[PDB]
Design a protein around this ligand. Structure first.
Ligand SMILES: Nc1nc2c(ncn2[C@@H]2O[C@H](COP(=O)(O)OP(=O)(O)OP(=O)(O)O)[C@@H](O)[C@H]2O)c(=O)[nH]1
Ligand SMILES: Nc1nc2c(ncn2[C@@H]2O[C@H](COP(=O)(O)OP(=O)(O)O)[C@@H](O)[C@H]2O)c(=O)[nH]1
Ligand SMILES: [Mg+2]
Lengths: 425, 83, 52, 431
């Protein structure tokens, strides 16, 4: 009786949600028609023997969600929880938040409310969205505000797609990213940033995919998202509730962006040991967000294992990693790790690019190095904002120029928060 | 060798514990920001303000286009004066 | 045929091409689709030497 | 479903509009009767953007055909695809504009405009979700220039929240000897600067030079000039007609291409450049495609892109090719030619790839640039305008229609301001 509602906003959130629910189904033996022929901890994510995902898909245009209600999982979700408008936010935060958002926010809240009615102990939300899209950025912050008013005591986790120029579709994505981050900063309890370039490089290097597509990326993303939710979906021992992510990973409310590192990513081979995959957690080439944690300091570090993992091997791997690597923590934090083993084996999509592994690990850490991702975004915002390039598209929608300064000042404050947390004595 | 293992939980499909290598050096809780409730009435007030700003923008554009129409009628009347 | 070539050269200001076409026997009063001769074209385009 | 309403005005607008429909119809498998006969499902996936589905599974262009010249109706109806157009969407006058912008904008054009607005209102209300409008027209004549810009202004009043896109043919004394064409073009540019969201500058000067110098045609005809126009229009609209991620609608294209509202005049380019009757022996490689489409010899506006800077660029690659090779080549031209790209708009060059190539080509590429070098086109028109305007030459043809001389002064000044704004952003630095 501790249900979680997944909310997928815009194209990226919807397509990532497809990959995530596809993997949840394989890991829980649920067929595309909702039937499972085979612990009832999966009931936190799935409600005449049919199992319907506790999810809501929202997009301001229908082409993406139309593929969902037409594809292999057309009978998995109820038609009511797939919400689409007629006109998208045209890569503009102001359209998604103000112009087109206003028209369907009540309908989306009503559909979310129907899933909340089916809950005897709602824990909170998992919101999947892009930073750069008009809907992903504008509609999500609008929705996050409402969710705080209507469901005050509930937790709100994010899985945010950070922009990469290799797969970027709009020049104004840095504007949308800063605008959304500023406005949803007070309404998110923990947010897992997924840099599209970090994922793209893992597909190119570890999977040998010459030019990765959203399919290649989303399957990798889903694999990491699944590791983070395995604790909530199965009867695990670490991260058993949404409130446990704030307890374990976020020490201060504004510093709520943990870095996720996953290992092993192997192309579809002798099995990699516990020590080998634990060492990969400290290599920056395996992270969700491109940054260097070796330059910054840690305030929280969780190792989430899956499959054949013996606690004896985990402790020996951690013992060697401290004596061979420099893993500095902030003065006010104990240098240590919260370990969790989820006996459920790592599951991959049968035809996918990832290989089946006997054991896998996902390290969730709160490092000050993640501020590098903010700095890169803030720089691109500054280059354009100094000339007011594209700002007329936002102002024309009813937004004020002052909202940009407000959001950017909050970003400088956030970068300065990461700086303060990191000094000594 | 200075490793302290604190067994946290043991469940049906899981097992958790903490591994303390070293305690914090700063013996206290520091001050950096340390942090209230947004209202629906306040949200709707900002959303309505933007809605009216957008409406004013379209009204200004329409006023400008309608002045072109008044001008066009003046042009048509001016031709009439000649022949 | 030489009349079309003479009209192109008169419009394009090709002084030497006109001199060659004239020596090869092109019709000086050849007309374009609008009844304009090479003189009309050189007059429109301002090629004084071609007019002369 | 993101519908576009197409409007074609005047002799040029109707000539290039007809070629646009003949070309995109072939790509989508639509014959002159409106029937579909294709192999690919990608042909019909986004057919709704340009075509209405009539009873009997027929497809009919969402196109309005306008001209004050009555004889234009017969030439459109007699074309290869004249049969496909909705008969009630043909709105023709009896008295032409006689190469006079004032006649098309204020007098004969104004007499016919409500008949056109009735037909655009009907196509617009029938749309599930209208994106905006696309107008094909020339700026050197009277109907396309004057009446086309009058239509833009009236359409903007009723549909202010829709994208206004135009394919505006710029005049050149290389292709037309009409003395007043710089007047008509300056008056039109003044209208376009204020009332359109994005404009493709199809310059008759560049078209003539491509035919003469590159294609080796001693005397290019309008057919030769229009082969380049249709090839361009097909390329620049590929993203709107086929399934894709980037610049898939007129609004997302404008957010990507226009950083300052007035700076919305695009320099179109394409590769490989071909004439009518020229066969392709082999397909271009990705480096040949990338190099050619950025070349000044491949631009549809007579401007040197190395005399300005690119504010934004949209590159569309058509056909089956390596996306890894495309990305490498796109990064290569930007890193090798870094001084012709503004450093204060990061990642300003967006690249799309569509699997379906145009007719007779296995591989092709279309370029759309918003370059500060476009001021070369405006300065050329401004100079021609000024030469006549200081002599008060031919003004009675315009003031005789009720026009005020002050309108010419206002239009000249606005276009000259536009030129100064491009120069301001060309000289801007990322401080
Ligand atoms: N990893 C990943 N990123 C995606 C996906 N689809 C889009 N993106 C990224 O998301 C950003 C674009 O935003 P979208 O999510 O497409 O936009 P949207 O939320 O639908 O918003 P509008 O189209 O403006 O209404 C870019 O950074 C893309 O690279 C996807 O399936 N996976
Ligand atoms: N590219 C091209 N330019 C044309 C065509 N027809 C006319 N023009 C140009 O358009 C201008 C004359 O405008 P036109 O369309 O004939 O006049 P309207 O009927 O009054 O709109 C001149 O600059 C011509 O060179 C055509 O088919 N193709
Ligand atoms: Mg979208």
């Amino acid at each position: 009786m501790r249900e979680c509602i997944s909310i997928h906003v815009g194209q990226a959130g919807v397509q990532i949600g497809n990959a995530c629910w596809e993997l949840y189904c394989l890991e829980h033996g649920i067929q595309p028609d909702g039937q499972m022929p085979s612990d009832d901890s999966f009931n936190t994510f799935f409600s005449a023997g049919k199992h319907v995902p506790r999810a809501v898909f929202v997009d301001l245009e229908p082409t993406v969600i139309d593929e969902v209600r037409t594809g292999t999982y057309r009978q998995l979700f109820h038609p009511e929880q797939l919400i689409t408008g007629k006109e998208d936010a045209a890569n503009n935060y102001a359209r998604g938040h103000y112009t087109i958002g206003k028209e369907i926010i009540d309908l989306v809240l009503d559909r979310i409310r129907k899933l909340a009615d089916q809950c005897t102990g709602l824990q909170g939300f998992l919101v999947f969205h892009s930073f750069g899209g008009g809907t992903g950025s504008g509609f999500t912050s609008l929705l996050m505000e409402r969710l705080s008013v209507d469901y005050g005591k509930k937790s709100k986790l994010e899985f945010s797609i950070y922009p990469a120029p290799q797969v970027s579709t709009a020049v104004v994505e840095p504007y949308n990213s800063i605008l959304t981050t500023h406005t949803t900063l007070e309404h998110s309890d923990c947010a897992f940033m997924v840099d599209n370039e970090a994922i793209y490089d893992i597909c190119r290097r570890n999977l040998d995919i010459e030019r990765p597509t959203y399919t290649n990326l989303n399957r990798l993303i889903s694999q990491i998202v699944s590791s983070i939710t395995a604790s909530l979906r199965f009867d695990g021992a670490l991260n058993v509730d949404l409130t446990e992510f704030q307890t374990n990973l976020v020490p201060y409310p504004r510093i709520h962006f943990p870095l996720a590192t996953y290992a092993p990513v192997i192309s579809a081979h002798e099995q990699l040991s516990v020590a080998e995959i634990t060492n990969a957690c400290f290599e920056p080439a395996n992270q969700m967000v491109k940054c260097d944690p070796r330059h910054g300091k840690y305030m929280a570090c969780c190792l989430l294992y899956r499959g054949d993992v013996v606690p004896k091997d985990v402790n020996a791997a951690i013992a060697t990693i401290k004596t061979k690597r420099s893993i500095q923590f902030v003065d006010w934090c104990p240098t240590g790790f919260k370990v969790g083993i989820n006996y459920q084996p790592p599951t991959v999509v049968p035809g996918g690019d990832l290989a089946k592994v006997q054991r896998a690990v996902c390290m969730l850490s709160n490092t000050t190095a993640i501020a590098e991702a903010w700095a890169r975004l803030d720089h691109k915002f500054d280059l354009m904002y100094a000339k007011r390039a594209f700002v007329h598209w936002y102002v024309g929608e009813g937004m004020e120029e002052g909202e940009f300064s407000e959001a950017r000042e909050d970003m400088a404050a956030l970068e300065k928060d990461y700086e303060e947390v990191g000094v000594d004595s | 060798a200075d490793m302290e293992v604190i067994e946290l939980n043991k469940a049906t499909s899981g097992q958790s514990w903490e591994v303390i290598l070293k305690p914090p050096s700063f013996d206290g809780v520091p001050e950096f920001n340390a942090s209230r409730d947004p209202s629906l009435e306040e949200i709707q007030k900002k959303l309505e303000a933007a809605e009216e700003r957008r409406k004013a923008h379209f009204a200004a554009m329409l006023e400008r286009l309608q002045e072109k129409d008044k001008h066009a009628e003046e042009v048509r009347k001016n031709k009439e004066l000649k022949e | 045929d030489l009349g079309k070539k003479l009209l192109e050269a008169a419009r394009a200001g090709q002084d030497d091409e006109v001199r060659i076409l004239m020596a090869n026997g092109a019709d000086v009063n050849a007309e374009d689709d609008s009844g304009k001769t090479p003189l009309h074209l050189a007059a429109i385009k301002g090629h004084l030497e071609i007019v002369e | 479903m993101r519908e576009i309403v197409h409007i074609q005005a005047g002799q040029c607008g109707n000539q290039i509009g007809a070629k646009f429909w003949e070309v995109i119809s072939d790509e989508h498998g639509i014959d002159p009767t409106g029937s579909y006969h294709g192999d690919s499902d990608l042909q019909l996936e986004r057919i709704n953007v340009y075509y209405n589905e009539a009873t009997g599974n027929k497809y009919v262009p969402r196109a309005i055909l306008v001209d004050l010249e009555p004889g234009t109706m017969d030439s459109v109806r007699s074309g290869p695809f004249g049969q496909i157009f909705r008969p009630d969407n043909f709105v023709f006058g009896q008295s032409g504009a006689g190469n006079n912008w004032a006649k098309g904008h204020y007098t004969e054009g104004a007499e016919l405009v409500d008949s056109v607005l009735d037909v655009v209102r009907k196509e617009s209300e029938s749309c599930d979700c209208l994106q905006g409008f696309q107008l094909t027209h020339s700026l050197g004549g009277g109907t396309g220039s004057g009446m086309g810009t009058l239509l833009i202004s009236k359409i903007r009043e009723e549909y202010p929240d829709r994208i206004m896109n135009t394919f505006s043919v710029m005049p050149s004394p290389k292709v037309s000897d009409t003395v007043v064409e710089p007047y008509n073009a300056t008056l039109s540019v003044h209208q376009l600067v204020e009332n359109t969201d994005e404009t493709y500058c199809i310059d008759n000067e560049a078209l003539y030079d491509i035919c003469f110098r590159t294609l080796k045609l001693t005397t290019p005809t309008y057919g030769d000039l229009n082969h380049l126009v249709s090839a361009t229009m097909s390329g620049v609209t590929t993203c709107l007609r086929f399934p894709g991620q980037l610049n898939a609608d007129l609004r997302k294209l404008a957010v990507n291409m226009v950083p300052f509202p007035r700076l919305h005049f695009f320099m179109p380019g394409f590769a490989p450049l071909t004439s009518r009757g020229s066969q392709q022996y082999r397909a271009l490689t990705v480096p040949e495609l990338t190099q050619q489409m950025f070349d000044s010899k491949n631009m549809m506006a007579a401007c040197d892109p190395r005399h300005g800077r690119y504010l934004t660029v949209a590159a569309i690659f058509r056909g089956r090719m390596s996306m890894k090779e495309v990305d490498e080549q796109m990064l290569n031209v930007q890193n090798k030619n870094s001084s012709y790209f503004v450093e204060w708009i990061p990642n300003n060059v967006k690249t799309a790839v569509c699997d379906i190539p145009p007719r007779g080509l296995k591989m092709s590429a279309t370029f759309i640039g918003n370059s500060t070098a476009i001021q070369e086109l405006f300065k050329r028109i401004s100079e021609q305008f000024t030469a006549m305007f200081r002599r008060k030459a031919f003004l009675h043809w315009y003031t005789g229609e009720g026009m005020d001389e002050m309108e010419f002064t206002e239009a000249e000044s606005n276009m000259n301001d536009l030129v100064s704004e491009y120069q301001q952003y060309q000289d801007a630095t990322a401080d």
